[PDB]
Design a protein around this nucleic acid. Structure first.
Ligand SMILES: CON(C)Cc1ccc(O)c2c1C[C@H]1C[C@H]3[C@H](N(C)C)C(O)=C(C(N)=O)C(=O)[C@@]3(O)C(O)=C1C2=O
Ligand SMILES: [Mg+2]
Ligand SMILES: [Mg+2]
Ligand SMILES: [Mg+2]
Ligand SMILES: [Mg+2]
Ligand SMILES: [Mg+2]
Ligand SMILES: [Mg+2]
Ligand SMILES: [Mg+2]
Ligand SMILES: [Mg+2]
Ligand SMILES: [Mg+2]
Ligand SMILES: [Mg+2]
Ligand SMILES: [Mg+2]
Ligand SMILES: [Mg+2]
Ligand SMILES: [Mg+2]
Ligand SMILES: [Mg+2]
Ligand SMILES: [Mg+2]
Ligand SMILES: [Mg+2]
Ligand SMILES: [Mg+2]
Ligand SMILES: [Mg+2]
Ligand SMILES: [Mg+2]
Ligand SMILES: [Mg+2]
Ligand SMILES: [Mg+2]
Ligand SMILES: [Mg+2]
Ligand SMILES: [Mg+2]
Ligand SMILES: [Mg+2]
Ligand SMILES: [Mg+2]
Ligand SMILES: [Mg+2]
Ligand SMILES: [Mg+2]
Ligand SMILES: [Mg+2]
Ligand SMILES: [Mg+2]
Ligand SMILES: [Mg+2]
Ligand SMILES: [Mg+2]
Ligand SMILES: [Mg+2]
Ligand SMILES: [Mg+2]
Ligand SMILES: [Mg+2]
Ligand SMILES: [Mg+2]
Ligand SMILES: [Mg+2]
Ligand SMILES: [Mg+2]
Ligand SMILES: [Mg+2]
Ligand SMILES: [Mg+2]
Ligand SMILES: [Mg+2]
Ligand SMILES: [Mg+2]
Ligand SMILES: [Mg+2]
Ligand SMILES: [Mg+2]
Ligand SMILES: [Mg+2]
Ligand SMILES: [Mg+2]
Ligand SMILES: [Mg+2]
Ligand SMILES: [Mg+2]
Ligand SMILES: [Mg+2]
Ligand SMILES: [Mg+2]
Ligand SMILES: [Mg+2]
Ligand SMILES: [Mg+2]
Ligand SMILES: [Mg+2]
Ligand SMILES: [Mg+2]
Ligand SMILES: [Mg+2]
Ligand SMILES: [Mg+2]
Ligand SMILES: [Mg+2]
Ligand SMILES: [Mg+2]
Ligand SMILES: [Mg+2]
Ligand SMILES: [Mg+2]
Ligand SMILES: [Mg+2]
Ligand SMILES: [Mg+2]
Ligand SMILES: [Mg+2]
Ligand SMILES: [Mg+2]
Ligand SMILES: [Mg+2]
Ligand SMILES: [Mg+2]
Ligand SMILES: [Mg+2]
Ligand SMILES: [Mg+2]
Ligand SMILES: [Mg+2]
Ligand SMILES: [Mg+2]
Ligand SMILES: [Mg+2]
Ligand SMILES: [Mg+2]
Ligand SMILES: [Mg+2]
Ligand SMILES: [Mg+2]
Ligand SMILES: [Mg+2]
Ligand SMILES: [Mg+2]
Ligand SMILES: [Zn+2]
Lengths: 214, 122, 62, 120, 114
RNA sequence: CUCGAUGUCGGCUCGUCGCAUCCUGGGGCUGGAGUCGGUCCCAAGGGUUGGGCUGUUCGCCCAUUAAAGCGGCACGCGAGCUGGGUUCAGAACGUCGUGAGACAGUUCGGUCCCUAUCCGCUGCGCGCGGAGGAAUCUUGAGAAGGGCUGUCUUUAGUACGAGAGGACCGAGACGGACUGACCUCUGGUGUGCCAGUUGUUCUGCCAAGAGCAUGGCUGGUUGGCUACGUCGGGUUGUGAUAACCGCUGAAAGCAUCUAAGCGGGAAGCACGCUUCAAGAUAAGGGUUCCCACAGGAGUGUUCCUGGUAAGGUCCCCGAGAGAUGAUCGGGUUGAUAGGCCAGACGUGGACGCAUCGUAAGGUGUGGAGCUGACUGGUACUAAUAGACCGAGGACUUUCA
RNA sequence: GUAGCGAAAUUCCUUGUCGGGUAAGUUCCGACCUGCACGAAUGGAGUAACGAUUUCCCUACUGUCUCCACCAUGAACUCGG
RNA sequence: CCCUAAACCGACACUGGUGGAUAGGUAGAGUAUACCGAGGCGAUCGAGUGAAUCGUGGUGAAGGAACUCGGCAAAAUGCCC
RNA sequence: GUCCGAACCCACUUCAGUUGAAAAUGGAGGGGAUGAGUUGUGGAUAGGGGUGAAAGGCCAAUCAAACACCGUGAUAGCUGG
């Protein structure tokens, strides 16, 4: 229902800048490269309004026949990635249209979505901030234990949703209201004030800020 | 960073020589006091000739932390001793003199009198 | 902790059937004079050679 | 070169250092060595660093190589035979090839060997 | 990547003098005073230079009123009007952290070429 | 009920639920100038501090805070921890007993095990199905998370009040706590890197080094991991409502918030925000690709074998991934890793030589040498070579 | 029931009362005596020295803690026995 | 023939117990400790892999007992003149 | 029956172990260490007895009366079958 502008990019890393109030600002560098409209979704044929964007450099021998046919119908060269943008203005998008970082101006607030860095199987003390037990005073082989995990004969069970150890990281995380610092479209570079999820080289979705601003 | 039980020296001439942080004002559960934060202290040691007695509960503003202090321009300031300056309950010093360097964060519209009496504002 | 009850035959077999191994795959030696089966990306134990029909290199003196 | 990330060979990092240095020395002594996959792949970077340092023969370089190895006979071999053998090679002075497994403990085995043929 | 570096080149400055930790330095730091601005000189000894592109920063230690004050400045910060080098020290360490616990004659640095 | 054992106080950890609400939200009546209160209706979304004393619960006190709620869950939680108290054998004191001994009197000391089978729960795979086999992108039935709050400025010294005093409803700024991601900054780490150095043994010796002593010990320290670090977040709202305030209006010629109906009305309810999600067997939808193979039995073809297409897996090189599976990238049509070359970071002036000093050593040659992770190049090395799986016009019925 | 001692390893009431120490002290330290239920070889009251005894305080010191992070290792984990 | 032990006492080829003699060098007060000698060993399942977690060590910003029944453990101190 | 401190003897604290390496130990500290010391060999004291710097401690890995055999197929208003 909401109209969203969007673009796809790659997390190149971070550096720092100084703003006009001489304030040090951390900036993430996103190679908000050229994206092409591979497919437009309409209520008539698909049931919702969204725009599928491409983006990515792919080797010709690593694109299969179904993907090649999809891109041939789109009328564009094959791209590595394909990500949709749920926008209510999908129609205004034509098949094969060119999208560049200049879709965002010098002070727009954006939401950046990416897959967070993985940590493997994490303990409770790390993946949930559990305070363990003391290091001394008789603590017996339970320094990083989760403590109790329930009650007693009532309910004689462990409630669903209890926080215990497990695999943390590698998940969809959206960080909101990041003010774009600068856009240089002729080389497809975006400087966004903040820290975005994911390791260097990961795919990032930069969309217009859902909550507009602070 | 100044927390409960941290002992600080005094940059005033009130006669107090050492304070013990009893609390860090500014909200519940607050851990630490930084440059320009107000704390409740007890006077562990004082000069025998002075207007402050040992065991007196006072309020002070923290100047000269040891840890570090970031500034919006990306620079940092660091001292070699945790200091504090006593207050009269209205934001004004109890003493009539300030000793040693004073942080610039005291001159955030708040402690004008202390900054004026500061021998050096860094 | 200790096993409260003797596990049933069905459950014991359900768990035990998963203790198994996969067969080693083996690949035909590229050397025409050998034609034997060896592990992939591994020198042929018979000819003691490695590489494609053309650029073969001796690896094991066997 | 790059550290080993995971747990070290021989049950101790000091023992891993000793193992890698001795294994490189034995590689240079014998031309080739069968030393299981992980040891060979971990000794390859150090051995190639040493060979590259030995590609140019100076007294200072010989002393620096003798910091490792520590057998001057092997240092002489490295600076006289292995070194000049790689005049035109830009790295890649060694190669690793898998052999199979050990019956006793199923250790995947491999032979690492210094390149023998001249690049020219 | 080098894209990061070429972006950093837009923020890096060129009028930085050459100096090492152990050198006496006056940093002309710009101080904002409400409507006013001023240039205040921080004079001291460089005790550290944490390097790397636009991230380069250096630490200056001063002894004022019986207390030591350390200030860390990003080498390309726009708050620094300029940097003056007074003495070139003769030290043996990259980081002069031992000077924190030294005062008096034990805390003074030899001059270069002495 | 349990004595062929249901371990008994308080704290720690982890929560969850009730509302008989401590704070924050809303409203009536007030014995409600203002400011505040005090009553008792709504309301459980979130929040509800750190210490001194005592084994304590309780309680008192100190300093805060928007507030320091009350209770249930075997007085939650010892196959999670604690053993200070209690309730073993030792001993002492008081009291009692002739005595052995006794004491909800006191005191000092005092062993507490478990490799998880089943359910439960947090994670992660394999299989099969999803009426052909695949590749990609998805809808959201439904599920989860999130929901705190202060101070100051302004409206305004306005309203009110005799004064002193001092607003509501709005606007802005800056915080605390909590929390998501993250490593540019700061801090920590550092079994790598550089450097110094003690003892000792060794490389014949000099020179230059090596082993061991916790990395022998020290001084630093990139990458990675991280918080003490820096960025973001709670919301601005919508709908139906609670108490409550109403409009029109009878029964009952009036009146009445109500009987017909309509409107306002809270941090609560459902959305909004974030995340999972078609095993949603109701197994979805779009787009794209591959195609009517072969041989047998057959009994409407049926069904079973066999080679393939699209496609995928094994294997190998790896990390942005990871306990293992998995995931992602690369596999010569190749920069996937190592090496190599250059750079940056880090250390801080190598060896040799010259010169000065009796010597330890100093200076020069020379930001030297060394050097990992980061960056850019470069096929030099290894990603050889190959196998294996995988449809068939894809069941039937009716429609068009 | 004397000397002496006393809320004591004895004091139930009880966290007695006052004083010291702490920002805050049911413990401690010195006093009071109202000794539930001290007391003179089952010794009374003291005592330098001594104590892996019990108790309180100050200082130094620290991952005990605010608040944990990171490193290496023996198990755990994967493969073979 | 073993004999501060794989052969003895412990059910074991068991991190336990077992009397006496010899016992070099350097640093050292030392028969402590470190590295070595005479001499003897590489230890009687391995190969891997940065999971959580447990054990065993290491380091730590600022604070410094706020931990806790209790400074439990650790740190600091440490030698000679 | 001095002090510090190895051997030696001990066993205060803590952690680990607790189907252990071990039916009482191991790591880290800790007490004594010329003495009422410790240790080897042989010997003496025997069950209502021993011995005990005294804990009902110890007397062949469970002692408020050892172990073995015998009376004996003790007895059990009790539990089981
Ligand atoms: C402070 O109250 N707590 C809750 C109790 C308690 C606490 C700590 C302990 O360490 C012991 C005990 C109980 C006693 C019981 C003794 C008894 N015996 C004396 C008759 C007995 O019957 C046996 C046995 N073998 O059956 C034992 O174990 C026993 O001797 C023994 O050692 C004990 C303990 O260890
Ligand atoms: Mg902790
Ligand atoms: Mg432990
Ligand atoms: Mg049940
Ligand atoms: Mg089952
Ligand atoms: Mg590493
Ligand atoms: Mg191993
Ligand atoms: Mg070592
Ligand atoms: Mg540098
Ligand atoms: Mg039973
Ligand atoms: Mg209610
Ligand atoms: Mg609640
Ligand atoms: Mg509810
Ligand atoms: Mg009480
Ligand atoms: Mg509760
Ligand atoms: Mg209970
Ligand atoms: Mg339980
Ligand atoms: Mg007890
Ligand atoms: Mg008990
Ligand atoms: Mg007495
Ligand atoms: Mg009597
Ligand atoms: Mg007791
Ligand atoms: Mg367990
Ligand atoms: Mg839904
Ligand atoms: Mg369901
Ligand atoms: Mg970095
Ligand atoms: Mg650092
Ligand atoms: Mg040696
Ligand atoms: Mg040491
Ligand atoms: Mg780093
Ligand atoms: Mg009416
Ligand atoms: Mg009305
Ligand atoms: Mg030199
Ligand atoms: Mg009292
Ligand atoms: Mg009492
Ligand atoms: Mg009192
Ligand atoms: Mg008498
Ligand atoms: Mg008498
Ligand atoms: Mg008596
Ligand atoms: Mg007596
Ligand atoms: Mg007496
Ligand atoms: Mg005495
Ligand atoms: Mg004692
Ligand atoms: Mg103290
Ligand atoms: Mg292991
Ligand atoms: Mg196995
Ligand atoms: Mg012997
Ligand atoms: Mg033995
Ligand atoms: Mg035996
Ligand atoms: Mg000597
Ligand atoms: Mg020794
Ligand atoms: Mg020898
Ligand atoms: Mg022997
Ligand atoms: Mg054995
Ligand atoms: Mg592993
Ligand atoms: Mg330590
Ligand atoms: Mg360090
Ligand atoms: Mg610290
Ligand atoms: Mg410190
Ligand atoms: Mg201190
Ligand atoms: Mg305390
Ligand atoms: Mg506490
Ligand atoms: Mg201790
Ligand atoms: Mg110590
Ligand atoms: Mg003595
Ligand atoms: Mg002995
Ligand atoms: Mg004991
Ligand atoms: Mg234990
Ligand atoms: Mg003594
Ligand atoms: Mg005899
Ligand atoms: Mg007794
Ligand atoms: Mg016995
Ligand atoms: Mg009898
Ligand atoms: Mg008879
Ligand atoms: Mg009978
Ligand atoms: Mg019965
Ligand atoms: Zn062959």
């Amino acid at each position: 229902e909401r109209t969203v502008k969007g673009v796809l990019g790659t997390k190149l890393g971070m550096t720092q800048l100084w703003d006009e109030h001489n304030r040090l600002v951390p900036v993430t560098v996103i190679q908000a490269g050229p994206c092409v409209v591979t497919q437009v979704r309409t209520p008539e044929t698909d049931g919702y309004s969204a725009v599928q964007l491409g983006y990515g450099a792919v080797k010709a021998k690593n694109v299969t026949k179904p993907e090649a046919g999809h891109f041939e119908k789109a009328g564009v060269t094959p791209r590595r990635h394909l990500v949709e943008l749920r926008t209510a203005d999908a129609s205004e998008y034509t098949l094969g249209q060119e999208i560049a970082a200049d879709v965002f101006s010098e002070s727009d607030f954006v939401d950046v979505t990416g897959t967070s860095k993985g940590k493997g199987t994490a303990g409770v003390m790390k993946r949930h901030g559990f305070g363990g037990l003391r290091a001394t005073h008789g603590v017996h082989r339970k320094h990083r234990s989760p403590g109790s995990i329930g009650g007693c004969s009532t309910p004689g069970k462990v409630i669903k949703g209890l926080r215990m150890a497990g695999r943390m990281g590698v998940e969809r995380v959206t960080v909101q209201n990041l003010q774009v610092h600068s856009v240089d479209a002729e080389r497809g570079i975006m400087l966004v004030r903040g820290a975005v999820p994911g390791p260097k080289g990961s795919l990032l979705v930069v969309r217009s800020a859902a909550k507009k601003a602070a | 960073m100044i927390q409960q039980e941290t002992r600080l020296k005094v940059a005033d001439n009130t006669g107090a020589k050492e304070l013990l942080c009893i609390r860090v004002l500014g909200g519940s559960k607050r851990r630490y006091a930084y440059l320009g934060d107000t704390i409740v202290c007890t006077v562990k040691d004082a000069i025998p000739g002075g207007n402050v007695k040992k065991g007196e509960v006072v309020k002070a503003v923290v100047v000269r932390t040891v840890k570090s202090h970031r500034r919006p321009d990306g620079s940092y300031i660091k001292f070699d001793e945790n200091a504090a300056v006593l207050l009269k309950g209205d934001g004004e010093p109890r003493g009539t003199r300030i000793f040693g360097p004073i942080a610039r964060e005291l001159r955030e519209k708040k402690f004008m009198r202390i900054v004026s009496l500061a021998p050096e504002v860094i | 902790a200790v096993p409260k009850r003797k596990m049933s035959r069905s459950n014991t077999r359900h768990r035990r059937s998963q203790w198994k191994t996969v067969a080693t795959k083996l690949v035909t030696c590229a050397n025409p004079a050998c034609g034997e089966k060896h592990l992939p990306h591994t020198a042929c134990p018979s000819c003691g050679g490695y590489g494609p029909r053309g650029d073969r290199r001796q690896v094991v003196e066997a | 070169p790059k550290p080993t990330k995971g747990p070290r060979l021989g049950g101790s990092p000091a023992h891993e250092r000793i193992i890698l240095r001795n294994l490189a020395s034995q590689l240079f002594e014998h031309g080739r060595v069968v030393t299981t996959v992980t040891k060979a792949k971990r000794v390859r970077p150090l051995a190639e660093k040493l060979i590259n340092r030995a590609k140019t023969d100076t007294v200072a370089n010989r002393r620096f190589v003798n910091r490792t190895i520590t057998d001057r006979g092997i240092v002489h071999i490295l600076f006289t035979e292995i070194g000049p053998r790689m005049e035109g090679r830009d790295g890649g002075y060694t190669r690793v090839t898998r052999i199979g497994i050990r019956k006793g403990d199923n250790a995947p085995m491999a032979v690492i060997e210094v390149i023998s043929d001249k690049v020219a | 990547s080098n894209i990061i570096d070429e972006i950093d080149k837009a923020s890096m400055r060129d009028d930085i003098p050459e100096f090492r930790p152990g050198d006496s330095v006056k940093v002309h730091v710009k101080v904002v005073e409400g409507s006013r601005t001023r240039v205040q000189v921080f004079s001291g000894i460089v005790i550290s230079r944490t390097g790397g592109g636009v991230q380069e920063s250096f630490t200056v230690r001063k002894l004022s009123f019986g207390t030591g004050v350390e200030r860390t400045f990003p080498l390309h910060s726009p708050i620094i009007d300029k940097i003056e080098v007074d003495r070139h020290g003769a030290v043996r360490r990259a980081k002069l952290y031992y000077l924190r616990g030294r005062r008096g004659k034990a805390a003074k640095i030899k001059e270069r070429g002495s």
